[PDB]
Design a protein around this ligand. Sequence first.
Ligand SMILES: [Ca+2]
Ligand SMILES: [Ca+2]
Ligand SMILES: [Ca+2]
Length: 151
Amino acid sequence: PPCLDSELTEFPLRMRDWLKNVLVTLYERDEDNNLLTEKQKLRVKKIHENEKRLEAGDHPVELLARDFEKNYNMYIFPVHWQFGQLDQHPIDGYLSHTELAPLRAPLIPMEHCTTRFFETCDLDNDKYIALDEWAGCFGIKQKDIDKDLVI
Ligand SMILES: [Ca+2]
Ligand SMILES: [Ca+2]
Ligand SMILES: [Ca+2]
């Protein structure tokens, strides 16, 4: 199904919240780093223990927007971690259309908007998504982009 502009506007808010929450479940499911490496796990623990963390639930988009404003800091790692997970074939700091396939799966919220959203983040039109085009699209500030959280 086609992706309305009205839907496209919510996509990043929905996607960002989803990443934050999926990363939290991995932290809980992990047994002896079978799911997260020690470094990644330690970063997620801080998010999981945060008293102000917005729990998963059905939240109107304006509440999601407010939490990103107030708790911007807990979204930095989730956004980077996801890029690192997809950049694999080959690992080069860019995401091709093929590497984006997992985000086009039925269980992704608004997955019919994925391709249209990414065309939007591709500022230089090379059909690949660089880390900075990725982070920027998800609202991460320029000063917070850090290739080291992608490892
Ligand atoms: Ca790549
Ligand atoms: Ca879906
Ligand atoms: Ca590009």
